Amino acid sequence: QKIRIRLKAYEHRILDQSADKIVETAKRTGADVSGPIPLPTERSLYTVIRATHKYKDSREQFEMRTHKRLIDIVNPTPKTVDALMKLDLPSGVNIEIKL
């Protein structure tokens, strides 16, 4: 009800520690928070050849990995909105809230 937020980061340990912190602060003044729903964690690849002039027969690659979590909140209080705007850190994850 009128709030659901998203979590997107690179390291799942920072993800679920900040997710457990906000679940701890979730039903503080409110109630009925839904847990950390996982997401399929998009991934990219690249390709860089291991030389500077020749030698395409030997290569190298890397990866992007984007871990995504999800926490829903049902039937909230008004007091948690000003509480969650007092909740700002860590900085490795970026939240994505709606109403």
Partner RNA sequence: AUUUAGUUGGGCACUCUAGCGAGACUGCCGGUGACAAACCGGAGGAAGGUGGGGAUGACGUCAAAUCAUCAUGCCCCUUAUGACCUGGGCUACACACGUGCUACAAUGGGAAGUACAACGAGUCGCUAGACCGCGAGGUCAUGCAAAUCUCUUAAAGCUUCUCUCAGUUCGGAUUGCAGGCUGCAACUCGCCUGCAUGAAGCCGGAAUCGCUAGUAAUCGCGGAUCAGCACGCCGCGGUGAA
Q: Write out the residues near another protein by the rule CB under 8 A.
A: 10, 45-49, 52, 57-65
Residues in the chain: 99
Determine, following the binding rule CB under 7 A, whether residue 99 of this chain makes contact with RNA.
Answer: no
Among 1, 35, 42, 79, binds RNA (CB under 7 A): 42
Q: Please enumerate in sequence order all residues whose Cβ is within 8 A of that of 5, keeping only pairs 6 or more positions apart, or say none.
A: 22, 70, 71, 72, 73, 95, 96, 97, 98
Footprint on residues 21-40 left by RNA (CB under 7 A): 37-40
State which residue, 71 or 93, has the beta carbon closest to another protein: 93
Q: CA-to-CA distance for 59 and 40, rounded, in angstroms?
A: 28
> Least distance to RNA from the beta carbon of 83, Å?
25
94: its two tokens? 């970026």
Residues near RNA (CB under 7 A): 12-13, 15-16, 37-45, 47, 52-54, 59-61, 64, 67-69, 96
